[PDB]
Design a protein around this ligand. Structure first.
Ligand SMILES: Nc1ncnc2c1ncn2[C@@H]1O[C@H](COP(=O)(O)OP(=O)(O)NP(=O)(O)O)[C@@H](O)[C@H]1O
Ligand SMILES: Nc1ncnc2c1ncn2[C@@H]1O[C@H](COP(=O)(O)OP(=O)(O)NP(=O)(O)O)[C@@H](O)[C@H]1O
Ligand SMILES: [Mg+2]
Ligand SMILES: [Mg+2]
Lengths: 311, 277
């Protein structure tokens, strides 16, 4: 799995720090400030009292029949087996007050959506590295536990000042998906055209989501409908016409003047409507853009902390 | 409404155990001596236009009485607190009834239950009341008898959030394409285009449930359902995928018709259900 030693020693450090904090319950924790809210939940920076560590706690509020509530908690505990340098450090899952809480790593810089609004645009040099991180996370996930992510978007890519990139909120539990997560629709859509028409989808849908996300971060704007010609130089629609656009119109593409062929082609291959012809992860891993950025020399942590103002 | 303005003689009615929450207040069981269902609402709006429409619809419901429509009994409003009192329905929801192993539906029973529902909706339409929420969970079946509940209720504007949406799947299956196209965060349910035609589309979905004892679309991300419903594609593919009988399927294709104007009236639907096996 090409597991670096640097990586295995901060993986070891947090699995053994994992049993040092032990077990879990509500009043062990204490608030700090508002990290945010979405898809039926709020997550807050927390301090655990037995162990001075600061964590991030995800509370979502679900009054339903308790049988499926416990099926959810037991399906969610598999997060304990999921451990890679590219998937958020998971610590524990518990039921309390009919409010499921997930305790995870705190990520200093938040989500690439958050990163993006202050940063305005994300350079190409760096989007190379985040792309490698995402394909690694998705392959790790597909090979090791045989799952797919089902919810890839910039607000689910998390960054820290130590310079790592990892994915949060992947679809680990089927019950929680069918009973809560499915019912939400936001103001934007990252869903593939084959998921929207309800066929069987695969990790291909995730390739599509990642491609749309890379466009959004590269140009600073949610990419569909495509920016108008004058709006492009500077750099009101309901949800159904968005979905109908996604299914019945050409996909976004990066502007041809600004980014290399390798990047334009990477995203063009992620955004092919037919999932059979869309690149899979094996193919994306050996793509020109990837071979370039993997062998490049970027100091990520520096860009991040001078982007947002950390240390 | 101080409840003494209604034709049901009432000295006192007592709250009993609750039996479910929802977007429109909390529903308790109660004793008027007869059992009743009591729905508790609270009015955020506090603007007297909302209470004016509430008064309008509640005295409109007074004028109804029909053996397939739940009996509307009373409503009182001590704003912001309001209460709607209807007759309590013994028996099981048609929803949980078709989904029972032990239950035995057949080419006759389905048509009979459907004709009951059609008579009820036809009454409601004659008096110019649109249900706006016909679905399998709002029809009750006790031995022979079939009763429609929870009608007219979507027209009111009490406390129900964020600027996203949360849409149950069971509900969206009953929604016609006109409606789901207009859904978008920050849009309230009251602004949606419910109608008589949308009601017959929802009847189409309840008939499909009578045939197949399940949803026509398997649980999935709500954005997917919105596209498939509002494109008309999803309903064409369901009519393709596993079929029922030709005369049976004709009623489904009529009720689910993409263009709302080509949908049949409930009076006509009675006839269509008559000329069957
Ligand atoms: N471990 C974490 N560390 C720091 N910020 C986090 C963490 N997890 C989530 N967040 C932030 O929480 C906010 C919303 O999270 P979330 O509940 O995932 O909503 P969402 O991403 O917009 N939709 P969804 O992920 O599908 O539930 C975002 O601003 C994230 O940056
Ligand atoms: N007349 C009635 N007799 C018996 N049960 C009733 C009656 N009216 C409502 N109920 C019950 O009240 C409960 C909640 O109804 P309701 O608040 O309308 O929620 P819902 O239909 O499940 N979805 P929603 O309409 O959004 O709230 C359900 O268990 C119904 O069966
Ligand atoms: Mg997230
Ligand atoms: Mg109801």
């Amino acid at each position: 799995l090409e597991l670096d030693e640097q990586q295995r020693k901060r993986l070891e450090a947090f699995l053994t720090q994992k049993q040092k904090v032990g077990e879990l319950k509500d009043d062990d924790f204490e608030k700090i400030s508002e990290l945010g809210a979405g898809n039926g939940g709020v997550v807050f920076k927390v301090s655990h009292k037995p162990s001075g560590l600061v964590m991030a706690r995800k509370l979502i509020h679900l009054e339903i029949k308790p049988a499926i509530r416990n099926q959810i908690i037991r399906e969610l505990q598999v997060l304990h087996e999921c451990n890679s340098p590219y998937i958020v450090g998971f610590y524990g899952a518990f039921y309390s007050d009919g409010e499921i809480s997930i305790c995870m790593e705190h990520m200093d810089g938040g989500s690439l959506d958050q990163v993006l609004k202050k940063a305005g645009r994300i350079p190409e040099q760096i989007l190379g590295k985040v792309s490698i991180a995402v394909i690694k996370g998705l392959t790790y996930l597909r090979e090791k536990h045989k799952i797919m992510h089902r919810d890839v978007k910039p607000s689910n890519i998390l960054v820290n000042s130590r310079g790592e990139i990892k994915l949060c909120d992947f679809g680990v539990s089927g019950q929680l998906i069918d009973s809560m997560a499915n019912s939400f629709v936001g103001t934007r859509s990252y869903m593939s055209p084959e998921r929207l028409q309800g066929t069987h989808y695969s990790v291909q849908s995730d390739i599509w989501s990642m491609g749309l996300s890379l466009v959004e971060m590269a140009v600073g704007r949610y990419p569909i409908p495509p920016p108008d010609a004058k709006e492009l130089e500077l750099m009101p629609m309901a949800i159904f016409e968005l979905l109908d656009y996604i299914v019945n119109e050409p996909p976004p593409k990066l502007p041809s003047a600004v980014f290399s062929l390798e990047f334009q082609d990477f995203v063009n291959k992620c955004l092919i409507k037919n999932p059979a012809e869309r690149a899979d992860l094996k193919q994306l891993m050996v793509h020109a853009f990837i071979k370039r950025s993997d062998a490049e020399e970027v100091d990520f942590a520096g860009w991040l902390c001078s982007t947002i103002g950390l240390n | 409404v101080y409840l003494q303005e209604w034709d049901i003689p009432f000295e006192q009615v007592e709250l009993g155990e609750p039996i479910g929450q929802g977007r429109w207040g909390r529903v308790h069981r109660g004793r008027w001596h007869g059992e009743v269902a009591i729905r508790l609402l609270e009015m955020d709006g506090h603007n007297q236009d909302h209470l004016k429409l509430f008064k309008k619809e509640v005295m409109n419901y007074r004028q109804t009485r029909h053996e397939n429509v739940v009996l509307f009994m009373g409503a009182c409003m001590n704003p912001p607190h309001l209460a709607i009192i209807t007759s309590f329905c013994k028996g099981r929801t048609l929803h949980s009834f078709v989904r029972d192993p032990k239950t035995s539906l057949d080419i006759n029973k389905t048509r009979q239950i459907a004709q009951e529902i059609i008579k009820g909706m036809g009454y409601l339409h004659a008096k110019g009341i649109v249900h706006k929420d016909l679905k399998s969970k709002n029809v009750f079946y006790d031995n022979g008898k079939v009763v429609i509940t929870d009608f007219g209720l979507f027209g009111i504007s009490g406390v129900v959030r964020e600027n996203q949406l949360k849409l149950s799947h069971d509900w969206l299956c009953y929604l016609a394409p006109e409606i789901v196209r207009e859904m978008t965060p920050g849009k309230d349910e009251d602004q949606l285009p419910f109608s008589k035609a949308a009601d017959v589309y929802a009847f189409g979905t309840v008939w499909y449930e009578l045939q197949a004892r399940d949803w026509p679309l398997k649980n999935q991300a709500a954005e997917a359902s919105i596209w498939q419903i509002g494109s008309g594609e999803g309903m064409k593919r369901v009519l393709t995928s596993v079929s029922l009988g030709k005369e049976v399927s004709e009623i489904l294709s009529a009720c689910w018709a993409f263009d709302l104007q080509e949908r049949p009236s409930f009076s006509l639907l009675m006839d269509m259900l008559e000329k069957l096996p």
